[PDB]
Symmetry: D3
Subunit: 285 residues, 6 copies
């Protein structure tokens, strides 16, 4: 049974990548409130990691990405077919691990949240490949489905074993939108160079440019080319800057940071979470 | 939420393709022993259909196929990204259907059987993409995992609601192997022309041809070309025929048919299932 | 200047293709009413030939076609750069020839009709390449511009030298739509097999299918694949038939043919033209 | 009819590029001689601009170019099919504009000049794509038809509304060559990306010289045939042009031409604004 | 050393292909005059085959060919790198075999002929890939280098051990040209469909079409495309036929056959060769 | 015959590359021992040069390389077919020059060494393209055949006209390995960036990485990609450094260097060759 080794090799590859430090901080922060017992908390952490990583392996294939956090994407080393099988294998390894929580609502919640993630991803993929730019409201809505999938899996499972009956769903929605838009910004403003444009996807900045200059189809046409061409990409970033789309993403990110601090105090404060949000906000201005 | 409609369009497309008749027949066949109550049986039939199709959606991306049962492969119409997301989605819709059985071991078994399916696909993919031809025993072993995933799911779930506690795994193993090698044989002997050679996969007839003639590295090299060229395929089938690898697969399918019947009689017989196995065996 | 020979070779090649006997019948059919003097009429006949062929040479590059009227498309032999320059050269040889009519409103009309052609094609290309399926009204609208460009050029230049001042634009619009929709139908129902589906374009049958079954985005996605794959094409033609798109197209064509006859008897009859219209109608 | 907006978008995209400044200067300079009424002169400039730009849009497609004056080429944003049609439309917008001059010979001359432009491009494309290298005299001969197409249109139309009876074709020929050869040098020696002319496979002045100058080598012909984007082959190729003296040869041709333009300007009684432009454009070598 | 088996597999693959039966018939034909001992003659036949086959392996890589004598070309199965090394290896096995003749001129001749073979191939490729169509006299002269390379090795080695010193080079030239031009005609008239067009090579009929019709650059342009499109090829074969290229080649082949009979009868006749040339000539 | 000009162009090109200066310093180093008369020695150096260059022309095609010693590979300028022919031609021009030595064992040795070389080459190719990584010892064995091919031809031919009967093959083997492994290290540790990974080849450092960490299939999968992607290459190089493969290669090269010195002292010393080896060692 070194079948398991071969099957999990693409996953193990991805564990080299950065990302666990922030996932750890989030669990610790939210456990400040939920006060979940050590044994259940670790199964929940393990499970979160597996599903998150499983879904990143798949997103990279859906998105024809080249790098992730400075590293080549699993499937550019091992191939698409091996990575798909492996990611899916790992999803069901997660489900197996969830059953070790031995709580009758755990699998019910796991299903709900994985169904929600797939709706978020579905829409993203749908808009891109059928060339229908979403409205800003549509976009935010699917980001809450995408990111609320894993956000709400983690805190939902924790809640099964917590006495903390205050409402976190609003705060999770803010942090979801925050991570995603922050990501959308980073990708086009500083993964390799402007991958989101090669992907052809509609991210926060490109959406803004599209609706801000409706006589133009320039961004749409560029996204449709799925181009690796550095000069086209450069021209496009120059264009978003002119139309004020980076500006508008910056301000959207400042408001979401404000709201996060507002929502955290509403729950009595959480210094560790404020620290992480302040640290993650460094990446504008 | 006409989003649901969009997310399931690849799945709905695939429900047009032939297949249900034989999945339906098996369910009736096994329920002659298992005698599952009607409300639980439909939930099971629905769940089997979803997971089976979902895995086909993916297998075709994994395998780069062009046709399935005479239809274009889903992703050749809606694109890979969409089809992956939609197959994975239906997996979970399947999990959610399974919770409605309201049996404490249903999920446990569901999990076990998918892990297996995936351990089986893993190896198929691994050997193909890393150019390690499996031995016949290794090949058979993973088929039992690949097919055993779903066969064992359908029947495992049924047994949760049954007082038939006899062991059906040996029979499922034979059926699994029978379906797969049948498949393998049809593919290269009668999907479009020899898709398995274009996929580069090791199937029963080529596994035999490789180990049978170790002077020659010719079939390995042809697989590795992942070619659509019909003249290369024709040459290859001609070689498989000459080394008697189609004869060998026929004699393996004949042994399996006959083992099916003996494992069915060991269980108290089943006309319905013997009909299915005889009907499927006309192909050799 | 045997440069003239190299520059014009692509155009010369295109003149081996069928299509003149139709252009000639129309010329004669309208001249029944217009009764243009021979000297002017021959110049017009030549101008219409140059501009039409020049525009087809470009359409084939725009549309990525492989064959026209059973013959390889010009650029497939001579390459795209040489064809673009050649077609454009011929446009201006067209203009130079229009100048030999010596009618002050000649160039003015010529300019207007070519601008109109480019509007129709501009929309065709746009919808296709930015993936926006037109409503049926929108589509008819651009066909009128596309076909009307050269239809109206030929008859326009003729009417400058005629005493026949009755209005032919309604009849030409009916003839425009008729030729195009007929084209659209023959392309998908009987150029190589279903080239329009490989082009990715939206044609009358595919337009119907898309608004007729709004749950399904299937035709959109096939058009988006720009595929040569014969099975996808077969699958698509099967769907258009199931949803009633070919029937629908055949009805539109019938109403237009009817309307053609009404607009001809509106003008005082034209047996040469009713002949061409009945002949071209045999196709459905 | 927003149809015109879609039609004109690629053309509008090209109008962002540099190039108008030099066109404006030449119009002013030749009007020192031709003294064309400003009503007519505006119309002529607008027509010059339309046809010039339309012909670049097309040339970029013909020449598989990636940049022009530092910008992506229109067809790389909007697709080949859209820009062919857009460009062709603009040609006929051009014709329509020319008719607003109300001169019975305006269109005759329009036609004559585009037909000549088209002969020039024809030979350019032909030699490249049928792998026949032209002689230097052959090349110069076509450059006069290509560049003389548009020069002769601007100045020919102007002459329709002028009493200036002195002959300008020789000076325009000299300018034709100067601009084109200057281009050919800049392209390989220094807007367009690295050595695009090599990737095109075209026979330009320095390659032409290097081919006949060393008939025992077929290495330049063969590199041009490869249509390569490989930066090493291109670097290798420019080394060879420099070793064989093709860049020195081009520089002296360009000096000879600059001298001729000054002598020819002087025969027409001087033109300080044209000398300013020639002198400015000569800094380049 | 099972390295040898792997090293030689591509070569052994090609030994399945038709082509031996003629090479033998020839050897027998010339031994009718040269009367070589059968210990030397066998070693010579073995050297002929090795160098011919090895040179065909390379020619198929050079010419991007898909089939040879109905079979897939070696490198389409084993990959170019392996076949390049395998062919070169067999060249030096050939020289190894040549040394076992112990003739002190064997190697001098061996070298002259391969050097000559390579100057012919070199010219074929140079014209093709730098797009310079050769004149008819230029073509024929390289065909004499290309075919005479091997023809002149077989017979030149045989003559080292013969008391027959009457000159055979004029007959070997006639034969060389007879074989190649027969080939060129079969390719474009009856390997899969018109591969010589896909290759882009200038063959005897394409050469006639080009110079015969110097206004047209249609055949040059089609060859430059390096296309697999059945229609462009079809169109092309039609053009060659209309321009009379196929007639012209039939007559050139007729005249060589006659010149073959006169040069054989010049040498005292040779029924067994008049037999093969007759047999061959049936094809026009 | 300007034929020889065209045919030799790819060769003549490659002579622009650095590499002679080492080949000349080797000749002199060994001629300190062998003391070969000058007319014979010049012929040997020319023969060495031709066959070494001809073989590099083929290697670059086999290995799908872009650069060699900072210049473009021949076939990227002239195309693959022309270089294949030009390379093989030079081989036989080399056989011809060999015959000018007038030694009855010259062609026998020539043949033995080229055969030897093609055996090494074929194995490198075999492993790469059939995805069987060799063992360190296997690899070392084929390197001896590959490099020994040419090394042994130079020194073997020199020895035919030498009174020096001491055994050199142990020192040639040490050098052969030294040269190749030093190449394998440069290639990955400092040709464009890590061309070896794009090629897919198993070179000393990657072989170490593969066996050093058998749970991982990461280096194999990377090599399988035949990638140009700089990020995958960078990743890979970091991985090799983490597994200690560059240290490992460095210590092997240090062992080979010191062995060389022992072997040279065994033969009486050779300052010129010590100086050469010392210089080549500055690179680790
Ligand atoms: C509640 C606690 C303690 C932890 C939860 C921490 C987790 C699991 C966070 C994940 C939230 C998130 C950002 C999910 C998105 C996953 C996903 C499907 C990403 C793909 O989005 P893209 O838009 O394609 O961008 P990338 O390709 O750059 O990832
Ligand atoms: C027995 C009862 C009660 C019901 C039916 C049980 C089911 C669903 C049986 C089907 C089992 C089966 C044959 C599963 C295989 C699934 C799979 C991933 C196949 C992939 O096979 P390939 O070797 O890639 O060939 P195909 O891509 O053409 O399928
Ligand atoms: C009435 C008289 C005197 C003459 C007739 C004048 C002519 C030539 C009329 C032809 C009208 C017509 C059918 C015009 C369409 C021209 C065009 C640009 C067609 C290309 O559009 P597609 O829709 O791609 O058609 P294809 O299917 O050939 O590609
Ligand atoms: C005389 C007045 C008042 C105005 C003239 C201003 C104009 C329109 C000048 C045009 C001069 C010129 C250089 C024309 C060339 C047009 C053409 C078809 C260029 C394309 O040639 P390429 O060799 O492909 O070079 P580029 O692609 O680098 O442009
Ligand atoms: C004896 C004889 C006919 C020798 C010819 C050897 C040779 C190198 C032939 C290559 O033929 P091509 O002209 O490339 O056409 P084929 O590929 O059909 O052989
Ligand atoms: C006079 C003396 C003492 C020696 C002769 C000098 C010569 C000719 C030395 C050459 C020995 C040598 C290192 C040969 C290598 C032959 C070959 C075809 C190598 C190719 O191997 P790759 O691994 O592909 O490496 P490269 O592509 O970097 O060359
Ligand atoms: Mg995504
Ligand atoms: Mg992504
Ligand atoms: Mg499979
Ligand atoms: Mg499959
Ligand atoms: Mg069209
Ligand atoms: Mg078309
Ligand atoms: Mg140009
Ligand atoms: Mg250009
Ligand atoms: Mg050949
Ligand atoms: Mg050939
Ligand atoms: Mg090598
Ligand atoms: Mg190499």
């Amino acid at each position: 049974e070194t079948v398991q080794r071969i099957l999990l090799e693409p996953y193990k590859y991805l564990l080299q990548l950065p990302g666990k430090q922030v996932r750890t901080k989030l669990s610790q922060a939210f456990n400040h409130w939920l006060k979940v017992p050590e044994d259940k908390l670790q199964i929940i952490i393990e499970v979160t990691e597996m599903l998150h990583n499983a879904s990143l392996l798949i997103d990279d294939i859906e998105d024809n990405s080249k790098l992730r956090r400075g590293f080549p994407v699993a499937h550019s080393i091992y191939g698409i077919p091996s990575v798909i099988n492996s990611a899916n294998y790992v999803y069901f390894l997660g489900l197996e691990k969830v059953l070790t929580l031995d709580h009758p609502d755990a699998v019910k919640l796991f299903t709900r949240q994985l169904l929600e993630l797939h709706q978020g991803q579905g829409l993203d993929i749908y808009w891109r490949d059928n060339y229908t730019c979403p409205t800003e409201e549509e976009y935010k809505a699917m980001v809450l489905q995408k990111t609320g999938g894993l956000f709400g899996l983690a805190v939902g499972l924790m809640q099964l074993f917590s006495d903390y009956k205050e409402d976190l769903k609003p705060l999770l929605n803010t942090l979801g939108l925050f991570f995603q838009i922050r990501d959308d910004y980073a990708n086009l403003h500083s993964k390799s160079f402007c991958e989101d444009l090669t992907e052809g996807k509609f991210s926060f900045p490109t959406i803004h440019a599209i609706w801000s200059r409706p006589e133009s189809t320039q961004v749409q046409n560029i996204l449709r080319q799925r181009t690796e061409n550095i000069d086209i990409k450069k021209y496009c970033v120059h264009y978003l800057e002119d139309v004020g789309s980076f500006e508008y993403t910056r301000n959207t990110l400042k408001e979401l940071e404000a709201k996060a601090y507002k929502q955290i105090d509403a729950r009595g404060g959480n210094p560790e979470l404020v620290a992480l949000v302040k640290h993650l906000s460094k990446m504008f201005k």
